[PDB]
From Swiss-Prot:
Residues that hold substrate according to the record: 198-200
Listed GO MF terms: beta-lactamase activity
Protein name, per record: Beta-lactamase
Induction: By the bacillus licheniformis protein BlaR1.
EC number(s) given by UniProt: 3.5.2.6
Family the UniProt entry places it in: Belongs to the class-A beta-lactamase family.
Full-length numbering of the shown residues: 47 to 303 of 307
Length: 253
């Protein structure tokens, strides 16, 4: 759409867009197969894999960690080095706060980046490219994915048959109660419409959000809005994501 082109113009950015209405199979797409750094959006898919690997009771396993496991942003993990945290608590911290140390701890428990990639290939994701911890130039392929691949993989875990219903419920609930995305996809969606999302931010002004959006009534939409900019130290604007989401909803409604 020229509306997506206008936003790229307005915000001096590159936009990556894929949306799928699961009720009608109607699609919206702008650079849907273009690679962007996935940043923290990978945390959603990581918990997907963790849930697939553990019974719900297994999530109560206590993980002990050290101050050495702490990285750049540890909002929940910094508060519990002495007592440790359960896998369930770590998943909550990772998804709802984008706790980087929590993600690293979980990634360690599922066998590292190489193991995550293998499990993603197993669900049919041949594009998402986990390679390093955390993670996080143009245009290398690590650690990247596309808008299309991200909605496909998110839909697989949360809405389809890569997880049983009770584990599906956990993933969806954590993402519904995310604290980090109020100004992104949530801001571009109509009032009283449930949103489950996971945000991302990274170098080259990379600003991402992936989401499942429920109507009042009807089948959910799943959406990826990815973005990046020219310079390594470029700053992002959340409004780009919110506005892109409005454009997507208009083209679907
Ligand atoms: C802003 C932010 C998020 C997010 O909104 O999801 N996620 C965490 C992570 C994932 O993208 N980003 C980084 O570790 C890299 C950055 C640090 C601070 C500004 S970007 S830390 C910072």
């Amino acid at each position: 759409k020229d509306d997506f082109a206008k936003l790229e113009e307005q915000f001096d950015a590159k936009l990556g867009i894929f949306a799928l209405d699961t009720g009608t199979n109607r699609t919206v797409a702008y650079r849907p197969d273009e690679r962007f750094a996935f940043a923290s959006t990978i945390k959603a898919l990581t918990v997907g894999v963790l849930l697939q690997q553990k019974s719900i009771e297994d999530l109560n396993q206590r993980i002990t960690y050290t101050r050495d496991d702490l990285v750049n942003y540890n909002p929940i993990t910094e508060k519990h080095v002495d007592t440790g945290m359960t896998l369930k608590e770590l998943a909550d911290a990772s998804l709802r706060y984008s706790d980087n140390a929590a993600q690293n701890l979980i990634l360690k428990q599922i066998g590292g980046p190489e193991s995550l990639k293998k499990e993603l290939r197993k669900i049919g994701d041949e594009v998402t490219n986990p390679e390093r911890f955390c993670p996080e130039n143009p245009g290398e392929t690590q650690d990247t994915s596309t808008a299309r691949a991200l909605v496909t993989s998110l839909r697989a875990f949360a809405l389809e048959d890569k997880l049983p219903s009770e584990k599906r419920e956990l993933l969806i609930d954590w993402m519904k109660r995310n604290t980090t995305g109020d100004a992104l996809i949530r801001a571009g969606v109509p009032d009283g419409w449930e949103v489950a999302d996971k945000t991302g931010a990274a170098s080259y002004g990379t600003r991402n959000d992936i989401a499942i959006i429920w109507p009042p009534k009807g089948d959910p939409v799943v959406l990826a809005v990815l973005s990046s900019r020219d310079k390594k130290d470029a700053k992002y604007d959340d409004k780009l994501i919110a506005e892109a989401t409005k454009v997507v909803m208009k083209a679907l409604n």
